[PDB]
């Protein structure tokens, strides 16, 4: 099916507690495979997935140089943005960067991404053309002009259409037994009386991968979006995810409710009901 690779950079200043910390993590779909933390005793790129361990010393050294240099550059960037917003040197701030490539089911590039935020708010983003920028405010425009003068977009594009796609395909092959394996959700419905005239019906989805899933409740065939409590998909810790959807129903009307599950691991959407 479709796949993506993403790197997530977080640079956080902390006046009075040393220089800004830089953390980078890499993912292929919902599987993390690498990490770098400038606060580590001996900062170095480390593997976080079995299939990346086979990469040679050159790979790890290359990664580490990139992250070490980025660590320093983001410290300058944090100083620069503090100034762009006329902020004091007393506060802590964060710059985040999220970038990567999306591939279609045939392995071809669908599109690239390169977005950045400051203190959790969108700051500047590379447009889908991988050639122009969208700045959120007059501060981001300074960065935009600096990046346009340095022809930065061209560098991002070269990477997104080149090495990003090439290495993602390599990872997909080396870790095909997991990365290209969709584990369907194990589903069931639980019943929990709340009072004499109401009961909670909870639809469970466990052990699925990837995280993308659609879990909904229907009453007489009509979606109960407004009356459904849907928790955020959560990691189990074994690579899989979990999720549940619940609805409070009138006692005795349980059979009018159906839970529907959609997941890549499922050839056809599933329909479940409470089974006393």
């Amino acid at each position: 099916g479709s796949h993506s690779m993403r790197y997530f950079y977080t640079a956080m200043s902390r006046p009075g507690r040393g220089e800004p910390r830089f953390i980078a993590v890499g993912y292929v779909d919902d599987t993390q495979f690498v990490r770098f933390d400038s606060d580590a005793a001996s900062p170095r790129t480390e593997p976080r997935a079995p299939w990346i361990e086979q990469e040679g010393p050159e790979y790890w050294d290359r990664n580490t140089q990139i992250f070490k240099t980025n660590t320093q550059t983001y410290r300058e960037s944090l100083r620069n943005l503090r100034g762009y917003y006329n902020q004091s040197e007393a506060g802590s701030h964060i710059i985040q960067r999220m970038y990567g490539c999306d591939l279609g089911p045939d392995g071809r590039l669908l599109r690239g991404h390169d977005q950045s935020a400051y203190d959790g708010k969108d700051y500047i983003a590379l447009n889908e053309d991988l050639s122009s920028w969208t700045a959120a405010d007059t501060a981001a425009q300074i960065t935009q002009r600096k990046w346009e003068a340095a022809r930065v977009a061209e560098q991002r594009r070269a990477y997104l259409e080149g090495l990003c796609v090439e290495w993602l395909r390599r990872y997909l092959e080396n870790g095909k037994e997991t990365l290209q394996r969709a584990d369907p959700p194990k589903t069931h419905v639980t019943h929990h009386p709340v009072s004499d005239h109401e009961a909670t019906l909870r639809c469970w989805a466990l052990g699925f991968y990837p995280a993308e899933i659609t879990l909904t409740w229907q009453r007489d065939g009509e979606d109960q979006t407004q009356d459904t409590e849907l928790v955020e998909t959560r990691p189990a810790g074994d690579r899989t995810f979990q999720k549940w959807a619940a609805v409070v129903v009138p006692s005795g009307e349980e059979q009018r409710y159906t839970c529907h599950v959609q997941h890549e691991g499922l050839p056809k959407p599933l329909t479940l009901r409470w089974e006393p």
Binding site: T73, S77, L81, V152, L163
Partner: peptide
Amino acid sequence: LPEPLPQGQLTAY
């Protein structure tokens, strides 16, 4: 693989 360093100076924000 993350974005490699450019030939010149990595451009800060």
